[PDB]
User: Fold sialoadhesin from Mus musculus.
Amino acid sequence: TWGVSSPKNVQGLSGSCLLIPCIFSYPADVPVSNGITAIWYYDYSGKRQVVIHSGDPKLVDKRFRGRAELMGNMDHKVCNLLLKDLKPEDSGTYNFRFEISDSNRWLDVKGTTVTVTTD
Ligand SMILES: CCC(=O)N[C@H]1[C@H]([C@H](O)[C@H](O)CO)O[C@@](OCc2ccccc2)(C(=O)O)C[C@@H]1O
Assistant:
């Protein structure tokens, strides 16, 4: 069954780090020969910036370069996103997408809202 489970809200402090827990799923009969591509988006419906791209890392916006890293193992169906050196501007929406093959790709429209404060 196709899906992405991650928190609706997550809070963090400026200069610290934060973890957005995440897990995904898909049907048992979906073939997976050459792994799964993992992608995280920031403000998808607006600026649409790439935070993580396990398939084409040069697509990662300079804004997040060196500051975001995917924790979980795709093999274990985990998509946890760790964000480092937080900035108030990091506040906004984050959505995960995984792409296996052909039409077997999925963007979670729910996403997680991030709130970074100074103190
Ligand atoms: C078999 C699983 C599945 O339904 N995957 C579809 C996904 C999926 O429905 C969404 O990602 C779930 O949120 O949508 C897609 O188009 C997205 C699209 C739809 C309409 C217009 C433009 C683009 C997508 O690539 O995200 C096409 C996929 O085939």
User: Anything to note?
Assistant: The chain has one domain: 1-119. Residues 2, 103-107, 109 surround PH5 (CB under 6 Å). The chain has no helices and eleven strands.
